[PDB]
Amino acid sequence: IINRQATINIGTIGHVAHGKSTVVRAISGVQTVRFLERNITIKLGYANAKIYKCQESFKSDKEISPKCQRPGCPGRYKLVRHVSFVDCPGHDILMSTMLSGAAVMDAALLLIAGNESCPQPQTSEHLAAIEIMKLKHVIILQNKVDLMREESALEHQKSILKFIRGTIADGAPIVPISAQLKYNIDAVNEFIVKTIPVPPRDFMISPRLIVIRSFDVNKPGAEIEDLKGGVAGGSILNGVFKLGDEIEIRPGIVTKDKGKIQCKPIFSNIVSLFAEQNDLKFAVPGGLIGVGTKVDPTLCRADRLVGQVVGAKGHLPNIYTDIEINYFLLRRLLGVKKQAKVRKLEPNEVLMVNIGSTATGARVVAVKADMARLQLTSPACTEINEKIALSRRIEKHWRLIGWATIKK
Amino acid sequence: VGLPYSELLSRFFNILR
């Protein structure tokens, strides 16, 4: 069996205490990163699944084990795909991480529990976000079905169907699966192969990398004369990387505190690539790879590198402090428990603008009709156009309003 | 389209502890 890395990024959405990590575990086997130094940087974890098919019935086709002994046929499984999971939490406080996750995602998985109430605002918000950020491949999954009645589940399904009609997602498949009992995952696997294809990707496009997580490889007990370099957990959308290249983290860093800053973006040479489980020479875009570079282990510690752009040497993108946005607003607010009408944008107000993966606070200067000018506090970079989600404050915490695009 | 879901549901109902 060949040790091929991740091909396409699949993300999972839900709610707090509903069950997402458990579902992930059921799907794959290797436990999630979340659940001080290691793993702790963002809200998303790290998981990997296997797609191997046995074609020699009905729904039973794909499996989780490398060896086929369970269904009947003793023959070895055929290699189809290998996928990486991006598990994003569905909490009312933390959403920036989710947004960041969304930017890299190519496939989405919705989770709704049976026993709880049918209309949930957070789930709706998530769906809206998915719709916004160039995602159409959505599979609806029912979580807790075993604790529900014979007709109640059907009713719930009907309600769901009624709800999802006017949205961009038209032909979304619905699967009921148990997380604690471990059943019906084969159908899900089959669907993964059926409904979702891999988009065309080539070597010709300029390298662009997005870092979500940060890692320091330091072990207690062992002497200091045996050290390991700083690892940046970064996912790639476009551009193939190989071992032996120069990488730079774009936005900038503060090194001296009197004296104006002039220091260039953080340069680092690649030491070792961590994909799936074992090290590989080539990096195929469409997965999260722990890129171990010559960067400090102290820098890759905690909340320092959350959603930052990474480029290869011989390419020049632009850095902006003032940004030109083309926005579109929604009718009523999504996320609030009660629904409130969206007000027109007022000059000079603190609003959270999420350009791809960056979590930045911006203030409005001029409003016309569709075009808006924003002043940023923390530095941000622009490459092409980018997919932007906008968030405002009305009551206590952040609420989503609509979508935006950079006009440059 | 909501047609092969029913069969799956039935199967789930059948296979339980």
Q: Please, are residues A258 and A277 in contact by the beta-carbon 8 Å criterion?
A: no
Residue A366 amino acid letter: A
Q: Identity (one letter) of the amino acid at A15?
A: H
- Alpha carbons A300 and A296: distance in angstroms, whole number: 7
Tokens coding A399: 């609420």
* Minimum distance, in Å, between the CA of residue B6 and any CA atom of chain A: 9
Which of the residues A59, A61, A158, A194 would you substitute to probe the B interface, choosing the one with the greatest number of B C-beta atoms within 10 Å?
Answer: A59
Which of A166, A201, A236 is the last residue in one of the domains? Answer: A201
The reply to whether A222 and A268 lie within a common domain is yes
Signed CA dihedral, A260, A263, A265, A268: sign only: negative
Specify the pairing of strand A388-393 against strand A398-406. Answer: antiparallel
Question: Do residues A311 and A391 both lie within one domain?
Answer: no
Q: What is the DSSP letter of A193?
A: H
Report which of A215, A208, A221 is spatially closest to residue A272, judged by C-alpha positions.
A215
* Token output for A278: 């074992």
The whole-angstrom separation of Cα A333 and Cα A339 is 6
The neighbouring-strand residues paired with A142 are A112, A176
Here the CATH number for the domain that contains residue A304 is 2.40.30.10
DSSP A354-380: EETT--EEEEEEEE-SSEEEEEEEEEE
Are the C-beta atoms of A14 and A109 separated by less than 8 Å?
no
User: Please, which residues bridge with residue A326 across strands?
Assistant: A371, A405
Q: Is A152 assigned a ligand-binding role in the annotation?
A: no
CB contact under 8 A, B2 and A161: yes
Does A218 show up as a binding residue in the annotation? no
A61 and A179 in a common domain: yes
C-alpha distances out from residue A366 to A101, A120, A395, A407, B2, Å: 30, 35, 24, 15, 48
* Residue A173: partners with Cβ closer than 8 Å, 6 or more residues away: A139, A140, A191, A195, B5
Q: In whole angstroms, how far apart are CA A369 and each of A44, A330, A348?
A: 36, 14, 16
> A301 and A337: one domain?
no
d(CA A399, CA A158): 29
Q: How many domains does chain A have?
A: 3
Q: Is there a single domain that holds both residue A219 and residue A255?
A: yes
Residue A285 identity = P
Q: Determine phi and psi for A79, rounding to 5 degrees.
A: -75, 120
User: What's the distance, Cα to Cα, between the start and end of chain A in Å?
Assistant: 47
A180 has binding-site annotation: yes
Minimal Cβ distance to A183: which of B1, B2, B12: B12
Instruction: State whether A11 and A35 are in the same domain.
Output: yes
Nearest CA-CA distance, residue A194 and chain B, Å: 14
Domain-ending residue, one of A201, A220, A251: A201
Domain that holds residue A220: 202-316
User: Which tokens in the block code for residue A230?
Assistant: 């700083």
Which chain A residues touch B9 with a CB distance below 8 Å? Answer: 153-154, 176
Hunting for tokens 């009305």 — which residue is that?
A394
- Chain A to chain B Cβ contacts (< 8 Å): 31
Please indicate if the annotation marks A122 as binding a ligand.
no
Residues A287 and A407 in one domain: no
Q: Of the residues A174, A201, A228, which one is the last residue of a structural domain?
A: A201
Are A174 and A288 contained in the same domain?
Answer: no
> Which stretches does DSSP call E strand in A154-265?
174-176, 208-216, 230-238, 241-242, 246-249
Task: Tell me the CA distances in angstroms from A73 to A27, A51, A61, A190, A297, one per residue in order.
Answer: 22, 17, 11, 18, 49
Longest dimension (CA), chain B: 30
**DSSP string covering A76-130:** PPEEEEEEEEEE----SS--HHHHHHHHH-SEEEEEE-SSS-S--HHHHHHHHHH
Picking from B4, B15, B13, B8, the residue whose alpha carbon sits closest to that of residue A195 is: B4
What are the phi and psi torsion angles at A225 (to 5°)? -65, -10
Chain B, residues 1-17, CB within 8 A of chain A, namely 1-2, 5, 7-9, 11-13, 15-17
What is the domain-level CATH number for residue A58?
A: 3.40.50.300
Q: Name the amino acid, one letter, at A94.
A: L
Are A19 and A144 contacting, i.e. CB atoms less than 8 angstroms apart? yes
- The answer to whether the annotation marks A103 as part of a ligand binding site is no
Q: A121-132 and A96-104 helices cross at what angle (nearest 10)?
A: 40
Contact A154 B9 (CB under 8 A): yes
Contact check, Cβ <8 Å, A183/B9: no
A chain contacts of residue B7, beta-carbon cutoff 8 Å: 58-59
Q: State both tokens at A85.
A: 């999971």
